[PDB]
Amino acid sequence: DNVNIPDSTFKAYLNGLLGQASTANITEAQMDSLTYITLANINVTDLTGIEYAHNIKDLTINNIHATNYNQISGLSNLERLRIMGADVTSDKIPNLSGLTNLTLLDLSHSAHDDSILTKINTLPKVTSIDLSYNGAITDIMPLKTMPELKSLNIQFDGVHDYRGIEDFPKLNTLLAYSQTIGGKKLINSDIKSSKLTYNAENQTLYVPFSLMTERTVNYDGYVPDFVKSTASSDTYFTMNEQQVNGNRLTITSDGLTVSDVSKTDFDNLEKMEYNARIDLSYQSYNTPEQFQNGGSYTISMPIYDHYFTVDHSLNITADSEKTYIENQLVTEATFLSDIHAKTDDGSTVTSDFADKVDFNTPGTYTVTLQSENNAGLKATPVQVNVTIKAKTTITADEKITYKVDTSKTEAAFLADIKATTNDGTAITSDFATVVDLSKPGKYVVTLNAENDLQKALPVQVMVIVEKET
Ligand SMILES: [Mg+2]
Ligand SMILES: [Mg+2]
Ligand code: NA
């Protein structure tokens, strides 16, 4: 019954509580006398022995740079827990389902992500949570399953979607003002320039707000607008990492318009960033009814940040090899169908196929596809390997002559007339339904030959059976 507390600074703290020397020993009975533990702004790196304090109702930890927090997983009699630090990532917290008398949970000012929720949504008696100041917390819907949750703080947190909230069984307070959507867990899109609009007569660039796909949606489906201010604090818009001056911006409910944009400027556009405020103010949206009974539901004035990568290329995708046979003929049009040649726009594809592919010399030929949809076509060309295969050709003798009542098998006959194809393709025959060999005369057996790719032109052999003396 004397307790292992490996951290000198941690034990030092605890001895100060018991009025003993900083380096004194501590007793399973001494641990059990403890009503609270408050570690703040001291470098404590391991919490072992805590697993020991079975009687604390208050654990309060701020900025201690602990490696993890595992050892708290079963303090059944703990009522109020608080752990804050810029380094407290979500992994450092164990699952908290043991904490069966916990009413209060504050993990504010930390570096948690969404994986924290599935550790804390199994808490039976938690009335309130503060996940305030966690920028990487982006969706709070998993907390709908907690039975007693009444109050939730997510101030300054990057949540964007409130659809589901009425699922909360007992919630009457959501504090959710000033989210910074895309602040920690970045939002990026890779996009075709076709999705934008360049007008050369006005020299204007238009960017449709329909691209801002992670924008705030209130619980009832309401989608607030971006502010229309072109002040740097309100809108921060970037082209190729260069901030565009307010004087050039015009903002509507549909999108944003830049003036003074040249054709060269537009073509050179590789990146945009849209960082702006959302127009959602005091008393400007619906509140669900749960929160109207003397609670509060503020989801106001969020901030949105959205990175863009712009692609002006038009690219062509098609099957990249094909096989025809030796001397049949194909028209470029039939060629393109076969390989399914397509521009990414739905414009034209040309080719040199008629130039490169030689149908009379079996082999493999490089066709290069090209396409010019644009005012111009920096449409990089994609190559296709067209393959010609040898025509499957039977060769044989054309006459053979046998005595009556000679016995002959089919395979003997094909051997006798040196019947053969150019590729290992099997010859079929009407031989044994055409020749008699009991009755003299002239019999015409036709040879044939087929494979996966072609049928040969049939060949005739004249089998003469002569009544010889
Ligand atoms: Mg801004
Ligand atoms: Mg109102
Ligand atoms: Na708090």
Tab-separated table of C-alpha atoms in Angstrom, residues 392-394 410 414 419-429 447-452 454-456:
chain	number	residue	atom	x	y	z
A	392	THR	CA	-5.280	-16.435	-90.963
A	393	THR	CA	-4.674	-18.330	-94.182
A	394	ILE	CA	-5.064	-22.012	-94.910
A	410	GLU	CA	-9.295	-37.109	-91.086
A	414	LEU	CA	-4.886	-33.120	-93.485
A	419	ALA	CA	-2.868	-28.730	-94.761
A	420	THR	CA	-1.718	-25.952	-92.457
A	421	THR	CA	-2.472	-22.389	-91.328
A	422	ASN	CA	0.035	-19.586	-90.602
A	423	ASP	CA	-0.846	-19.321	-86.880
A	424	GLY	CA	-1.558	-22.257	-84.649
A	425	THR	CA	-5.184	-22.346	-85.758
A	426	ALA	CA	-7.016	-25.630	-86.149
A	427	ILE	CA	-8.406	-26.814	-89.470
A	428	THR	CA	-11.942	-28.246	-89.585
A	429	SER	CA	-13.272	-30.418	-92.338
A	447	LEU	CA	-11.337	-26.856	-95.231
A	448	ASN	CA	-12.100	-24.103	-92.635
A	449	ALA	CA	-10.333	-22.422	-89.701
A	450	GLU	CA	-11.464	-20.017	-86.909
A	451	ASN	CA	-10.115	-18.167	-83.895
A	452	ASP	CA	-10.965	-15.434	-81.441
A	454	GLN	CA	-10.894	-13.996	-87.490
A	455	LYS	CA	-12.284	-16.675	-89.712
A	456	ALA	CA	-10.093	-17.808	-92.583
